[model samples]
Target chain A: LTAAQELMIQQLVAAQLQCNKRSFSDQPKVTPWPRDARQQRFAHFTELAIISVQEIVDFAKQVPGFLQLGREDQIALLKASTIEIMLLETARRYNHETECITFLKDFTYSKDDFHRAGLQVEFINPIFEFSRAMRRLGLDDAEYALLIAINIFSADRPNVQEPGRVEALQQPYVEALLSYTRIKRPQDQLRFPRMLMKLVSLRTLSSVHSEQVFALRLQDKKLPPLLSEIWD
Target chain B: QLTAAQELMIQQLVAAQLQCNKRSFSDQPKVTPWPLGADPRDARQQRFAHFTELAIISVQEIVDFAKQVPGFLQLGREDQIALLKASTIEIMLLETARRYNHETECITFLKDFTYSKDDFHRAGLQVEFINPIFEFSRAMRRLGLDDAEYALLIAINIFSADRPNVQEPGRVEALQQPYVEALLSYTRIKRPQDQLRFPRMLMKLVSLRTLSSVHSEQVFALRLQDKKLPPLLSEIWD
Candidate 1:
């Protein structure tokens, strides 16, 4: 049973990472903008945001008991936590030396593109800085997957229906994360707590990013409908 | 009464700050900014080495300050170190901002030296990180946060509940409560017109965590490139 359970979690992480990479593959090519090119880029961007959120939903469903919860509860938990997951995933794909983020092979968004798209420095810089730090930690695929899973299954987000059930579902993933880290790095037990602390750091970045997005929406009124749907 | 505990904790923090003979490293002997268009690597390495050493001293001072808070020593040693590791950078950044000098348009270090915006940037500090630190500092200074407020904020920061592997999160939360109450009372009496002051101040605390995380990453990346780090830094950071 233990062997099977470990295999299942590993499968889930592989599937989720696959979905994450595929979502990025849909982005339109980057090039000099024509007059209407900005609008077209925004359209692709909005679609990209939707697919990213959908990726989380699909991944969460594979976690045992996650889909068993009330559909509203699932939506609530996903909505509240997707940004955190997205930031984690995006940070993993960030390129520090070039000051751009890679969405897929050969597709990158420069710092200028981010600013032109209405992402202020306060929002963008922290994300990149965090991505760099996470990179330095040298986490393996299982660790990355487990951390993302832990974030998704959080039960304390306001308005989560059946918080107890959500918390119960989260327990195994947390345990799995602990076991994985300890087995992987027995000599450096501090890695377990240090890994957990990244959640705290991610929490701060998520809040700051949400604030920036909220302000940007107010000014431009151009945020994706799927993005708006999750925020509410 | 809760007021009594708050009053006592504030006094302890104040006493600790007064006795803190270790002025910030930013205040020590000045170094020239990296020359324009020159090979940047040499200067960058030097400044980073200097900054990391200062960070170690700042961490020690923070630990000393935390130990002074009543009941802080009662916590488990591992938990104590965890809390220090988690919150030391936040405490140091907050303290540095408080000492920022508006008249000279620079951050004051130990009442002896000041670094202009150009100096920090030329030293290879990323503008993205430096700008927010200065912006927050200037805004905080404008808020005119008193010494009492500063002390409480530092205490509250040290007792953070989110430290990874905290043996007793409930106990740590309890430790933070009195500082929260003290900050609320001080804000209500001091800045009654702005009812949002408390939440606003708390938001700034959140921002400080984000900034510290970013700065910590920068420090780590530098170290990863085979750069030499101070021994104290390896103890605390690694």
Candidate 2:
């Protein structure tokens, strides 16, 4: 029930809509700061990654009792979850027809542009597939907000002490999703389960992200300070 | 809350539990063989050896899993220890039930390895413990629990406030209430026509207590013979 409380659901959805404000009806050649053509691609993505992590942190705080988790666990959860949130956010921003991921301010990059960013295909391909799949789910703001909460409260994140507390906090959101789906999609008995399965796939993608981080390290390309702080 | 919030809660529980189960029990050994050849120990003692390891591993897994139960650690530290101390076997008995297999009329843990109560008897388990466990797992299976219900049932078991020596029974009680709501709402929506599954599941929790005591007896019965429990098991459960 998430306290089964409608107030909480409203707050969470509003928080999501408030935070996810990347509109791209306007665009191209606007202002590419750090405008170096050679490393320009991932550099731009990295800049957005930095902004996205901060946005995710704000979203995490709006979750009830997230602040109650001891400071270390809060940091730990954010560290592990921020990338997953970014992946999800990226998917939401992905344009299926154009096959481009648009960052804030309409700065969009296609698959080839991402590869030219010097990111390896092994990591890039899965990110595209995951985004494509997420698009098909066609989740609403409520579902997207709740999925973020579920991911942040994940108890299995490495080194999360008080995982029990993390899980307890996560439980109501799980219950809420179940109820939300029942009324929302009476005909598709399978939708809720499928979305929950996406939660599992995110973890796999998160791990793949870590692998790419390591590859980036070996290649000597330094991630931005904030991106390095959480992902590295 | 309306239907939307309730569905969301349960769907999230399923998602988290799928993570918890995979994290905690990802590599359970598949080879649950009945003892073979040349051990000088009696058949009962040999099979008892097999089951002691089961409890020990069960001990390790449940402890890891329990800490992740929402609000489990929020209890007084000693209460956390005591509740798990009392309830792991009961939880395992229920867990075994969830693992029951129909075609073989036996329980299977993993790929083709069925838990043979016949083999258990062949290995000389006493009729009292064996029959109760088999009966409990058998009937519990009949209730047809999915992963969500099974997870909630285990959560309810651990948070049973009445578990002996719980220091802050009130805190434990407070924590348990939502899970009860969680489980009831779950089955109500899931099996609306059945109408009795929620109460029926409650009764299974009640029955697990009796079987829990029976399990303790088996542990003690094994202890009476010459057996050394693993240090970790001995620490919590000996």
Candidate 3:
């Protein structure tokens, strides 16, 4: 990778880590357990999800060639991929050993607690499994960061105005990953294509995560507005 | 026109390369932490250099072994290089895991240099990568995969067509098919009571693919920090 592309990756990675730290901070404590505080926890979850999606959007714009696609293309890609990125963010903060997920530095939720918060078993199960798989794979900071770029810059999203242009934009991040992997893992020749395969699985998991999000919002009408905007 | 005997010879040849060397971690130099007030920059540079040297040696050992695989040599030379490039890391990691002695939590590299868990981390290896490796090592130990099984698995990893920029992916895929069948046959005969062992072993291959991907990112990020990587390491990385 050229010096410029490398620098771009660093900025994009910083953006992702910063967004995760910032959005997960405002989560209020749910002390009353599931009976009365269920609604409150869901609200908190929904709000944090929305803020995370928003932060991803803001960070994504800083990615190379994202803005060149213009407003319609950008929004289309963002709307399609925002939830996936949110799931990725959640996976990022997950602690495999403790079986707890950190939403903020101060606020960590156990698996049972997240389930009690109204997250469906279907969604909850996959996230936990995904978290374990991710840990087993040993994904580091830079790889996770590049994935954020790859997810948002997907060219094949339904109704993308400029598929070619979108693909063109996605190229640098792909190249960046390839370049990064080669240097980082000199022993693994297949590492680049292998990384792409993980992204493929993320798309599958994202749809599953998104289904849970949709179901949660249907049960609770009080979901924050920003979620419906990107998610709905 | 190759006979069954020739095929067996090839299998033996591959196994020999993988199992050729064995050494204990206690035989290695003891790792001493850098003292305080030393030049941190110089220390990191020296440590990274030592890492690259070991990594390059390990990878080269595998490549040299891959050359001896019967069909591997017959492919166009470029394809030979491509196959090595695509599969070397997976094979290396698999071999490394094979060498790991879980009780000691030490990995023996190059059949001589053994680094304990602490020395590995002190050399700047992240816990994320290190932890999975030990877990994988334990899993391998639990599986009780023998030398023949390791040989077949490494061959499957090497002959995979999933690699990018290969000129003859079909040929590569063709090469791996028999190895897969052989693994299944061997697994069935070896562990008739455990039907899931075959699939479980295959699943480990899938998991290793994921591990390889993560390691790729870690290596890249390490380089991005301007740590100098060896030329041979950089060459294969591309």
Query: Per-residue CA lDDT of candidate 1, range B68-157, in tens?
Result: 887789999999988888788788789779879888878865556567787777555666667667776886886688888888888878
> Model 2, A63-130: lDDT tens per residue?
98799999999999898788888888888889899998876554777888777767888788778977
Error of 2 at B230 (Å): 26
**Can you tell me which runs of candidate 2 are displaced by over 4 Å?**
A1-4, A21-36, B1-238
Error of 2 at B62 (Å): 24
Over A165-204, each residue of candidate 1 has an lDDT whose tens digit, in order, gives 8756766776776677667788874465556556766767
Query: What local lDDT score does residue A68 receive in model 2, on the 0 to 100 scale?
Result: 96
How many residue pairs clash in each candidate at the backbone level? 1, 25, 3
TM-score of chain A of each: 0.87, 0.90, 0.87
Q: List all candidate RMSDs to the true structure.
A: 18.3, 17.7, 21.5
Which candidate has the top score in lDDT? 2
How well is each residue in A1-232 modelled by candidate 3, as lDDT tens digits?
Answer: 7988779778877876776566555654334333567776776666556666667877877777788877999899888787677667677878877787776566677778777678888677667766665676566788888877877776546456776587567667766776788788887744554455456456545556666777876876445666767655
Please give me the total number of clashing residue pairs in predicted model 2. Answer: 25
Candidate 1: where is the Cα deviation over 4 Å? A1-232, B1-4, B22-45, B224-226
Model 1 clash tally, residue pairs: 1
What docking class should model 3 receive? Answer: incorrect
**Candidate 3 deviant stretches above 4 angstroms:** A20-35, A217-222, B1-238
